Amino acid sequence: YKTKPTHGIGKYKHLIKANLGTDYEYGVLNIHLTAYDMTLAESYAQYVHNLCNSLSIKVEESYAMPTKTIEVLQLQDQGSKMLLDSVLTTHERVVQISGLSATFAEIFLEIIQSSLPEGVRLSVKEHTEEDFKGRFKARPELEELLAKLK
Amino acid sequence: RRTPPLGPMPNSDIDLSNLERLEKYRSFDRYRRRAEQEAQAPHWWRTYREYFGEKTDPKEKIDIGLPPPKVSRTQQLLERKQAIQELRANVEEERAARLRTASVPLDAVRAEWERTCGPYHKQRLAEYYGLYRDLFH
Amino acid sequence: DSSRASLTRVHRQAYARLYPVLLVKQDGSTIHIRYREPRRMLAMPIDLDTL
């Protein structure tokens, strides 16, 4: 009851949660893991994903890039026509992270590059300017947005 | 009209500023264990234990039993650790435990139980039947 | 370490068998990848377009 000293004991909404890059912390980072082998790209992405969690580093999203198939042609023996030799598939995994300190950037990059497996290229890019953050929303999340607007 | 609380609030220690960098329970079992711990602590507000819990006197119950036996803990621990290592040394015990076919002898366990913690369990069990309450008040 | 998270297997219920092959690059370097056929090595040629 409001007049009782135990008023507000059942409150729970303040314990529940309802990008710009500052000069001291990086806003949004995308870690690209491009390799011809799909197992290593998925494994390293999992390796990085668990690494960030133990370091209290927020992971926005972990997804995959569309596969790029490249046909490999080789010149025929003593000829001019290209003959099909092999097929190479490009597999890329992207792990999105946010909330990285500028000083910690040197520490994080050195650990991952040392752990980088053979044949797996490591690319980290600032894509916060791209935006295009179109995500499907649920009803409870959508309903509260209208209440703020109304 | 408002009245200040008579004591600390339940969730007063939680920091609302850095809500994003706070570890979550993430599971029902983790919240359940923490919830029971707070339920066993006294509170300044009315609780279920106040009306249904068995009333007890602040004076701790006096002990009229024999003096406890004197045992050297340091010597006991050295032999206990050594025995486990030999038990784990056997490759058959590990395979039996991994295949989920191992079992312990019931007679041997009770023999050591009655010597180490058997008297302690009996005191708690006798208290449930109210033998200490009736015989020795 | 390069071997910190390199040792892994196909974590899928259904997939095709793969064999360890060497992908010889355009500079002679090789990387271990898994191919459908048990080929002993694979060599990447140089494209005439990028010439």
Add this chain to the structure above:
Amino acid sequence: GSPWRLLGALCLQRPPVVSKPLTPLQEEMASLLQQIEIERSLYSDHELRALDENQRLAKKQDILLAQDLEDMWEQKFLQFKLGARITEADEKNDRTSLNRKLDRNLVLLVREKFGDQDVWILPQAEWQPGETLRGTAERTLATLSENNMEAKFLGNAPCGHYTFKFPQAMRTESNLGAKVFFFKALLLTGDFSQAGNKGHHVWVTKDELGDYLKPKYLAQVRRFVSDL
């Protein structure tokens, strides 16, 4: 001013070029992972090709057999010679060439003379007003003797500090000691010239880093330098 001199130190490192060899325990797991992968996989085009050919031969229009095609692949692999993971510099123990120890990282050490005595320290230069502390470490590369290298600096914050005092000989109120700030960077490409190699600079791993550095100076370096 201040009675402590400012020196911008540089910690240049060479990333490994080749993957580190697997441990014996890693070999056991590596074989198992491939073995489990085979037993839980479906038939491939080459496996189905081999099975079909055997049945056709058993009953009795493919010119090339699946097994025969495998033999041709193995012939080409044997003719091609792979690169040497262990270079001649390892046998020569020439700690000046970047080609040695491709599996392990290398840290640059340069020999400098102070107080009529040669001391092995990281490359460093004195800080100047109107210049960032990181920029002083960058300037060290230009002062190097006949170097053509491109280095990638990671961040601007220093990775360590070492403080020493003069042995009561050069100690003064205006000049009491020095405080060096270390900056780590990655050596992308290039190498020094062939003019001076032995006495000028050496490239050593962390394990053999104590030979050149002093025990007190070694303690600060082993903190920001990994061995992964």
Add this chain to the structure above:
Amino acid sequence: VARKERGWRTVFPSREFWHRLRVIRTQHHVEALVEHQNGKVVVSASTREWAIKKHLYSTRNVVACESIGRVLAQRCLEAGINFMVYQPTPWEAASDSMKRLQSAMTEGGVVLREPQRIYE
């Protein structure tokens, strides 16, 4: 004829029982408790005691869980407890360690369901 604490329909677990089997398994040890509704513990069986530890290769595997039930069931018969309720979670019930613990209690002579109260 003793009344059970009916209610608590919106919370878990229930309170409508006389005795309850509560199993606590930690990172290193597994413990089972038989306690009255008022909170008093009747009998207990844990892997922390040397009596059970001296015969167990590991105190945190399925074998340890199964061995606790066989010893606990023996102690319940000596104590006189034959009926008790068990209130597991959906994931605990599906676990193989809890199924063998329940099997030991049933094979030990203890029934995992109390008889209904007699109102008339």
Add this chain to the structure above:
Amino acid sequence: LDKARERPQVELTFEETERRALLLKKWSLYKQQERKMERDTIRAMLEAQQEALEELQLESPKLHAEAIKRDPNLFPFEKEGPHYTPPIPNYQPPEGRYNDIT
């Protein structure tokens, strides 16, 4: 979805299962050492970097205010993947054509 490409499933011997089970338990400890070494390695860099900033702040706050600032030139950052064998100084790959299918 075709069932003709499925392979027969050979039963595993008791000893083969015995080896795999024990190897997966030895893999639980080897990976724990790799994480332990990585965990302490990160700790060494973090404590040394923070302590160096504390030393730098006292000497000159102007240099301390610049060290913690972000570096736009750092990103995009690319690291080339290692290779099992070093590149050949004199290697001429054959001629060919590359076609991409998306």
Add this chain to the structure above:
RNA sequence: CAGAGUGUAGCUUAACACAAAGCACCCAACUUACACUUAGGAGAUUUCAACUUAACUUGACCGCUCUGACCA
């Protein structure tokens, strides 16, 4: 180099004795991955003594940390 300070595996004001505990941590399975869950694994009192219980108290023995000596 002494000067003080300091002592359980990662943490803890866990440790009355019945006893070295709780949490964190690592693998496999599930999951794109994370998380949850299941099935598993590695673990500790610095070392000796003190009428004895002494992880606890009294001493050193041992390492660590801190301030100067030392120092390019």
